[PDB]
């Protein structure tokens, strides 16, 4: 009755406050499933009422409901938004699994994220991370794990995979017969990445790292995108799992791009200015090559690379002299 | 001489330059991995507090600002972008991004707190940009075009004594001092002694001294000491310190006793202190 009376009186602020009080007292005393659902409902109602504030009067003066130092939590919408997001994630996890349900019942945001990722509800984890400004690394890594699992997995895993894709949101329907569940999950991850993107280094890094859990040949589109953005990081991950030949191919391609041949695919703009060459990586590669010293083919490819690099450098010197003369 | 805490930078490439703060509680570091990292070294404990990635190319220099204006950190770069970071409640965010240059910005040096919050940016296009935060509004930009024929390598402001002056060294073999006259930055002096590219120039923070001292390291290796007894006269006298066989990179003066730290391509740091009679003598050799 109190709630109804306040909301009829358009006292949005007061109604919200009463619902917040309601929820707190509710939980404190009744901790049964029914009581917990009632608390969730109460918080939902509070949030909604506070959001009904007049556009003209875009100010909500909210005080801390100390009486379940009278604090004044000016939360606007941000803080209560966070609380309800937390409650809703608790609720969603409860449905999927029962024990983790009870665990969410009495836990925090990081804990929620952890359990959701384990269960496989990735989109919800993504959303929760964004609200509390937590980074998206966890969710991207979890997605990569599932993809690696499917790459080499049994039939039952494939079907369960199809299922959790419907729980998430596949953007479009593709008729390809060859795709199967695994490829559908790949596309889902890719789309989620494009939309919810932040620092590039972070997301690409974590995906590539998780992909190399037990080794994987990366696809050409991804390779090209990475080369156009962060070729240095692409080289470092190669050395992490000892892919020297691929590293050398990448180096040769980068040299070609710096020379104007397919520079677009490496993000090289070129009036000569930019010529950043990763010398340390080349050094480490040479060191790795000169340890075992057994494969004749490796030695041959090394020699070829070195000759080509020397040629490149002489041309660079000629161009140098020319441009210096020009400016002068 | 004594060894204190050795930091682990968790980096991926050669750290090109570093710089501590006013009170010695933090250390900024910049590498060729397009990343400026902030380290909180307090009571011998290496703690990475922030990682700032906003550049497209290598980061060359990092400069801390005076405490009164807050935790302001400038970072120049190859991508023609001068990014000014600022710490608010423990969080580092980009507040301003000056993109008005045609080539790599090589050096950033803040002005003495007395003058204001002025920052000078020397770039390889031969131009120096002076950014000025007036407290309210954005940043006023004063760009000195054609400062150096080939490019500008380093900038450093004079100790407040208020006539705003700063010294800049370029690849045209000339060390030039600049002075703000009538609100306009005008060329004041042209000091010529080097036979090759000037790599770094730093104005000594003269303490209790009528004389003004500037050090300049160069490609050929000759480190020169420029001294003017009277600021009015503006007559600068050079003095050869030592001709290093390998290219000297940068020079740095100590705040309290004016001890020059010289680094050459021989991966060693030689400390030089002027004696009472006048002759400069090396006091220690700290190699890598």
């Amino acid at each position: 009755l109190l709630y109804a009376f306040h909301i009829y009186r358009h006292n949005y602020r007061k109604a919200g406050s009463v619902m917040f009080e309601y929820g707190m007292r509710l939980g404190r005393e009744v901790r049964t499933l029914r009581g917990l659902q009632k608390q969730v409902n109460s918080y939902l109602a509070c949030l909604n009422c506070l959001r009904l504030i007049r556009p003209e009067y875009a100010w909500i003066v909210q005080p801390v409901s100390g009486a379940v130092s009278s604090q004044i939590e000016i939360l606007e919408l941000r803080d209560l938004e966070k609380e309800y997001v937390l409650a809703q994630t608790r609720l969603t996890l409860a449905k999927h699994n029962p024990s983790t349900a009870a665990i969410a019942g009495s836990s925090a945001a990081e804990e929620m994220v952890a359990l959701l990722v384990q269960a496989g509800l990735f989109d919800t984890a993504i959303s929760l991370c964004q609200t509390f400004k937590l980074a998206l690394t966890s969710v991207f890594e979890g997605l990569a794990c599932k993809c690696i699992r499917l790459q080499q997995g049994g039939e039952a895993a494939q079907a369960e995979a199809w299922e959790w894709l419907a729980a998430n949101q596949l953007a479009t329907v593709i008729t390809t017969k060859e795709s199967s569940a695994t490829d559908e999950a790949w596309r889902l991850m890719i789309s989620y990445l494009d939309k919810y993107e932040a620092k590039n280094t972070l997301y690409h890094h974590c995906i590539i790292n998780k992909l190399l859990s037990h080794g994987v040949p990366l696809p050409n589109w991804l390779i090209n995108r990475y080369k156009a953005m962060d070729a240095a990081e692409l080289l470092r991950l190669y050395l992490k799992y000892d892919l020297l030949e691929e590293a050398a191919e990448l180096v040769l391609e980068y040299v070609d791009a710096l020379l104007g041949k397919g520079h677009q695919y490496f993000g090289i703009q070129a009036t000569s200015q930019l010529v950043w060459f990763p010398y340390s990586a080349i050094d480490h590669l040479r060191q790795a090559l000169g340890e075992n010293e057994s494969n004749q083919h490796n030695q041959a490819i090394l020699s070829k690379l070195q000759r080509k690099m020397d040629e490149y450098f002489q041309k660079l010197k000629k161009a140098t002299d020319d441009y210096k003369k020009l400016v002068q | 001489v004594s060894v204190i805490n050795t930091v682990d930078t968790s980096h991926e490439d050669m750290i090109h330059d570093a710089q501590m703060d006013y009170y010695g509680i933090r250390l900024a570091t910049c590498s060729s991995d397009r990343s400026v990292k902030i380290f909180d070294v307090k009571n011998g404990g290496q703690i990475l507090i922030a990682d700032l990635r906003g550049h497209e190319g290598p980061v060359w220099q990092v400069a801390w600002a005076h405490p009164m204006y807050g935790n302001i950190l400038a970072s120049c770069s190859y991508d023609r972008k001068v990014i000014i970071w600022k710490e608010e409640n423990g969080t580092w965010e980009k507040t301003y991004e000056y993109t008005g240059h045609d080539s790599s910005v090589n050096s950033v040096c803040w002005a003495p707190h007395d003058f204001g919050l002025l920052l000078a940016c020397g770039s390889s296009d031969g131009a120096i940009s002076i950014l000025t935060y007036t407290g309210d509004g954005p940043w006023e930009v004063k760009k000195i075009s054609n400062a150096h024929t080939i490019g500008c390598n380093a900038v450093s402001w004079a100790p407040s004594v208020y006539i705003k002056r700063f010294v800049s060294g370029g690849c045209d073999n000339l060390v030039k001092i600049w002075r703000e006259e009538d609100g306009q930055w005008k060329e004041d002096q042209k000091l010529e002694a080097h036979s090759d590219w000037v790599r770094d120039v730093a104005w000594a923070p003269s303490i209790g001294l009528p004389t003004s001292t500037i050090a300049s390291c160069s490609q050929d290796g000759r480190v020169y000491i420029w001294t003017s007894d009277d600021a009015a006269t503006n007559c600068w006298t050079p003095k050869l310190l030592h001709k290093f066989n390998d290219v000297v990179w940068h020079v740095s003066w100590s705040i309290t006793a004016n001890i020059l730290a010289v680094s050459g391509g021989d991966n060693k740091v030689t400390l030089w202190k002027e004696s009472v009679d006048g002759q400069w003598a090396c006091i220690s050799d700290v190699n890598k």
């Binding site: 200015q273 020397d310 | 290598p58 990179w249 010289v262 740091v269």
Partner: peptide
């Protein structure tokens, strides 16, 4: 670790004037 002593090819291209600065990045003086 930083390469022990490669001082020839990179030195010839270190005397280059197209980007002596970029070739002289390895330097440091704080």
């Amino acid at each position: 670790e930083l390469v022990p002593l490669e001082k020839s090819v990179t030195h010839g291209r270190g005397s280059l004037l197209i980007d002596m600065g970029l070739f002289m990045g390895r330097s440091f003086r704080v």
